[PDB]
């Protein structure tokens, strides 16, 4: 037996199916058990099990193909993929998670791991172009699902490969970290409209370690502030977490409980 | 529980000068725009000054020139600066502000009481 797998299919999707895969991807991210403001905080890595380390999401597409990504629950980003008979995995930032992404992927003939880490300063250089530059929206997902699967068979260039990672990550992770970016998604279906996202969403992605800090740090939930993003790039502060509980849907783990 | 504190006004010179200030309380975000409309007795109410989060300001073709507002964004107030004084600036002004999206609000707009103006 194995790690959990959630199903999406960008052929068809809706807002209601992308929606209804956002919040199962989340359920199995977080245990409920520990909520800090009413915002869930993810499994602290320290002690964590490796059985319950990793969740798979499984993404198709109209060109039915198909590719299995895998999350870390402890941050919900991705460490990895696997496309046919091969996985592809970031290079890992230290020994203990190297050790860990070794339980993924165990039946698959052909395993690789990047020269280069996951992180969206390293994949924008090797796509030679910005997150403020790279589409997103259903169109984009169906056609990072391709590239991603191609490139197991060599059809796929590396710049082409990182932008495909650009878009899975802030479709998937982010979403999943962000109640706020989900909904641009969202909004990207409903309106069948491909478009990059504004400083809004780039600041919050920017944010989410300082603000699950500063929201496990705070006094009854005030900030000892965190700066975002309005739409239109210009600054403002948070003080408070009130304001983020539509915001921000689970926190990396900082500190123990209250 | 938004509060609009309304400060200056009152009777002045032709040519002389003064400031209104505007603060508000009871926001915990920054506005989206601020500034002052006025209400001339026997005419419609009409924008003079505002200024937005961005620090762009926008004026009435009639004070351009002759008023200038600023805004502190952190401190969630406005002042307008009132030179060259003129009969047609007296009037009522009234404090405006509005704010965008903080939870349970996706914005609000809110009105001052007013101060007069009068030119002598
Ligand atoms: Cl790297």
Redesign the interface.
Known sequence: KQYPIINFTTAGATVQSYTNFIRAVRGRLTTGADVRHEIPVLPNRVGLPINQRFILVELSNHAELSVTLALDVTNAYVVGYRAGNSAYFFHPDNQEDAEAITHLFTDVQNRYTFAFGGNYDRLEQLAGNLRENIELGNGPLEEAISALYYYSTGGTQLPTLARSFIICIQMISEAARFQYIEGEMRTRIRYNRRSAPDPSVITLENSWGRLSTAIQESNQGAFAPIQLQRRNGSKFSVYDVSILIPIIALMVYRCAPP | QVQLVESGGGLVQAGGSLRLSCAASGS???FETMGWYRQAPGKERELVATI???GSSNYADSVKGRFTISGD??KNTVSLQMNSLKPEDTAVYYCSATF?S???YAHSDHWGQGTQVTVS
């Open positions: 915990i975000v920054n937005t989060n961005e964004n952190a965008g903080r939870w349970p």
